[PDB]
Design a protein around this ligand. Structure first.
Ligand SMILES: CCCCCCCCCCCCCCCCCC(=O)OC[C@H](COP(=O)([O-])OCC(O)COP(=O)([O-])OC[C@@H](COC(=O)CCCCCCCCCCCCCCCCC)OC(=O)CCCCCCCCCCCCCCCCC)OC(=O)CCCCCCCCCCCCCCCCC
Ligand SMILES: NC(=O)C1=CN([C@@H]2O[C@H](COP(=O)(O)OP(=O)(O)OC[C@H]3O[C@@H](n4cnc5c(N)ncnc54)[C@H](O)[C@@H]3O)[C@@H](O)[C@H]2O)C=CC1
Ligand SMILES: Cc1cc2nc3c(=O)[nH]c(=O)nc-3n(C[C@H](O)[C@H](O)[C@H](O)COP(=O)(O)O)c2cc1C
Ligand code: SF4
Lengths: 430, 55
C-alpha cells in the first residue's frame, strides 16, 4: 500500500466520539459495546495477548512501546501479591485532548477495555487515574461504571465468566507530572507525584509494590475492538510497525480545530486540509507545526509538506509522534514567545525531584525569556543547546526530554530568526 | 640635564662618549604615574559552547 489515511466510518473504533449518541449503557449496547465480552474472558490471557501482539498495537501514550509486549511482561504467576491495571487518564499535555473525549463520550468502551486488559494480564482491579480537572468527566465515568456494575458487566462474576474484577476511578489534583506512569503510581499511593527510577519497572514493582501495568486510555479502549474485530484487521492500517488508528488533535492556527480518528500513516497536509479546513490563511500561511503536542520538536512548512503522521516517519523527521496532537502555527506568530511560554509551562509543571530538570528547566526558561525580547548575543544560543544536551538523558523520567526537545527543535529550525532578533535588539536598544 | 655647556663639553671630552644622548638620570620622557584604566582581555577558555572541561 502506498498512501494511507482516508478512513471510512465503518472502520472507526471510536464511534460516538463527538457525543452525538447516548453515552449510557442503553446507547452503548446499540453501538457494539459489551458485546461478546464473555467469549473474550473465557479464552484466557494468552489468546488475548496473542490477538493484541498480532494487531501490532504500539503504545498510544506517546512513546509507542509495543503494547502486547508491554502487557506480556505481566504474564507471570503471582507469589502472594495481586496484580493491577492502571489506566492513565491524566492527559495534561498541551494539544492533547483525546482521552478526555474517550472518558466523556465513550466510557463503556473504556470500562470494557479495563475488563479485557485485566483478564489479559490477570489484573485484579482497575484504577483509572483520571485527571483532577475532569470532574464532570469523572462523574460521567462514575455513572457509566454504575451502569456497568448493575448489568453484571464488571464486579462480582464479571460478564458471566467466573472472574471478579473491579474498576476504580482515582482523581488527580491538577498535575502534569502525575501523567508520567511512576509519578502516577506515587500519586495513587497518597504521596507527592515524584517519579520512581527504572528499574524496577511497574510490572516488577508498580502500585503499592504490586505488579502493575499503566496503560493509556486510547490503548486500553481499542483492545476490546482488537479482540472482537481481530488482530489482522487492526494491523492492516498504517505502515509496518505503525499499525492501528489514532485520535489526532488538530489545534492551534486552523479554521476548525478538531479531534478526528484517522488511519495511522496519513499525510499531515492531507489531514490539516481535509479534516480541519487548513491553516488560517491556507497552506501558504503555515510557518511551523509542533507535530505531536508540546513534548516533541516542531518541524517547519518545508518538512510538513510530505511527512507521514506515524511514529517512524516522524522519527526520520527528527521528532516524535507523541500523542499525535498537531499544533499548527502560521506566519504571524512570534514562535520564540510560544516556545518560551511552553518552557514556562514545563517549569510550572515539573516536580523538582532530581537536579537537571529542577535547575535546568528554570534556567532554560530564564534564557528563553531573555531570548523573547532578545536580551542576549548569538553565542548564548548554542550554549542553550548544550543545556538541552545536559538535560536529555540525565533525568529520571522524560519531562527532561519534553522540555529539552522543543528548545532543540526551535534552535535547529530557527537559528537565523533568533540571530536577527537579537541583533535588531542590539541595534535598536543601544 | 640642566648642566651648562662648558661642563657638558668637559664631560663629553672626559668620558669620550656622547653622554647627553643617554642620560642615566630619567626626566619627562618616562611614563606617567596616573595611567588610564585598563581593560584586560580574556583567555581562550571563556566560551559558552564546546567548552567542556575534559577536552
Ligand atoms: C670651579 C670653581 C667654581 C666655579 C663656580 C661653579 O662651579 O659654578 C657652576 C658652573 C656651572 O656648573 P654646572 O654643573 O653646569 O651647573 C648646572 C646646574 O644645572 C646649575 O646649578 P643650579 O641651577 O642648581 O645653581 C644653584 C647654585 C648656583 O651655583 C653656585 O652657587 C656655584 C658656585 C659659585 C661659587 O647654588 C647652589 O647650589 C647654592 C650653593 C651655596 C653655597 C656655595 C658655596 C661656594 C663656595 C663658597 C665657599 O660651573 C661652571 O660654569 C664651570 C666652572 C667655571 C669656573 C670659572 C673660574 C673660577
Ligand atoms: N500521553 C501524554 O499525555 C504524554 C506523553 N508524552 C510522551 O511520553 C514519552 C516518554 O514516556 P515514558 O514512559 O517516560 O518513556 P518511554 O521510553 O520509556 O516508555 C514508554 C513505556 O515503555 C515501557 N517500557 C519500556 N521499556 C521497558 C522495559 N524494559 N520493561 C518494562 N516496561 C518497559 C514503560 O513501562 C512505559 O510505559 C515522550 O516521548 C513524550 O512524547 C509526554 C507528555 C504527555
Ligand atoms: C512528563 C510526562 C507526562 C506524561 N503524561 C501522560 C499523560 O498525561 N497521559 C498518558 O497517557 N501518558 C502520559 N505520559 C506517558 C507515560 O509515561 C506512559 O508512556 C503512558 O502513560 C502509558 O504508556 P502506554 O503508551 O503503553 O499506554 C507522560 C510521560 C511523561 C514523561
Ligand atoms: S526530571 Fe523533573 S519530571 Fe523527572 S523525576 Fe526529576 S523533577 Fe521529576
Amino acid at each position: 500500500k502506498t498512501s494511507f489515511g482516508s478512513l471510512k466510518d465503518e472502520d472507526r473504533i471510536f464511534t460516538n466520539l463527538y457525543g452525538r449518541h447516548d453515552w449510557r449503557l442503553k446507547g452503548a449496547q446499540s453501538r457494539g459495546d459489551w458485546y461478546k465480552t464473555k467469549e473474550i474472558l473465557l479464552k484466557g490471557p494468552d489468546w488475548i495477548l496473542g490477538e493484541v501482539k498480532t494487531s501490532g498495537l504500539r503504545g498510544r501514550g506517546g512513546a509507542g512501546f509495543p503494547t502486547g509486549l508491554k502487557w506480556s511482561f505481566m504474564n507471570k504467576p503471582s507469589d502472594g501479591r495481586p496484580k493491577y491495571l492502571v489506566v492513565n487518564a491524566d492527559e495534561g499535555e498541551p494539544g492533547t485532548c483525546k482521552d478526555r473525549e474517550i472518558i466523556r463520550h465513550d466510557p463503556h468502551k473504556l470500562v470494557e477495555g479495563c475488563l479485557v486488559g485485566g483478564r489479559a494480564m490477570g489484573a485484579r482491579a482497575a484504577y483509572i487515574y483520571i485527571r483532577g480537572e475532569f470532574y464532570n468527566e469523572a462523574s460521567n465515568l462514575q455513572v457509566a461504571i454504575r451502569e456497568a456494575y448493575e448489568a453484571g458487566l464488571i464486579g462480582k462474576n464479571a460478564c458471566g465468566s467466573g472472574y471478579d474484577f473491579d474498576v476504580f476511578v482515582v482523581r488527580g489534583a491538577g498535575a502534569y507530572i502525575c501523567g508520567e506512569e511512576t509519578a502516577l503510581i506515587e500519586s495513587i499511593e497518597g504521596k507527592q507525584g515524584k517519579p520512581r527510577l527504572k528499574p524496577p519497572f511497574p510490572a516488577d514493582v508498580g502500585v503499592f509494590g504490586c505488579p502493575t501495568t499503566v496503560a493509556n486510555v486510547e490503548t486500553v479502549a481499542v483492545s476490546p475492538t482488537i479482540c472482537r474485530r481481530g488482530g489482522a484487521w487492526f494491523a492492516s492500517f498504517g505502515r509496518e510497525r505503525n499499525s492501528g488508528t489514532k485520535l489526532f488533535n488538530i489545534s492551534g492556527h486552523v479554521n476548525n480545530p478538531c479531534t478526528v480518528e484517522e488511519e495511522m500513516s496519513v499525510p499531515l497536509k492531507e489531514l490539516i486540509e481535509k479534516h480541519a479546513g487548513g491553516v488560517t490563511g491556507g497552506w501558504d500561511n503555515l510557518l511551523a507545526v509542533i507535530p505531536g503536542g508540546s513534548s516533541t520538536p516542531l518541524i517547519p512548512k518545508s518538512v510538513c509538506e510530505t511527512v507521514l503522521m506515524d511514529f517512524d516517519a516522524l522519527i526520520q523527521a527528527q521528532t516524535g509522534l507523541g500523542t499525535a496532537a498537531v499544533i499548527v502555527m502560521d506566519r504571524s506568530t512570534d514562535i520564540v514567545k510560544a516556545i518560551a511560554r511552553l518552557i514556562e509551562f514545563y517549569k510550572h509543571e515539573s516536580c523538582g525531584q532530581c537536579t537537571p530538570c529542577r535547575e535546568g528547566v528554570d534556567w532554560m526558561n530564564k534564557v528563553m525569556a531573555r531570548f523573547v525580547r532578545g536580551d542576549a548575543r548569538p553565542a548564548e544560543i548554542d550554549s542553550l543547546w548544550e543545556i538541552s544536551k545536559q538535560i536529555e538523558g540525565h533525568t529520571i523520567c522524560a519531562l527532561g526530554d519534553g522540555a529539552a526537545w522543543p528548545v532543540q527543535g526551535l534552535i535547529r529550525h530557527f537559528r537565523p530568526e533568533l540571530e536577527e532578533r537579537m541583533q535588531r535588539f542590539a541595534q535598536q536598544h543601544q | 640635564a640642566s648642566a651648562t655647556r662648558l661642563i657638558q663639553g668637559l664631560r663629553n671630552w672626559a668620558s669620550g662618549r656622547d653622554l647627553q644622548a643617554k642620560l642615566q638620570l630619567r626626566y619627562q620622557e618616562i611614563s606617567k604615574r596616573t595611567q588610564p584604566p585598563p581593560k584586560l582581555p580574556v583567555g581562550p577558555s571563556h566560551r559558552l559552547s564546546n567548552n567542556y572541561y575534559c577536552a
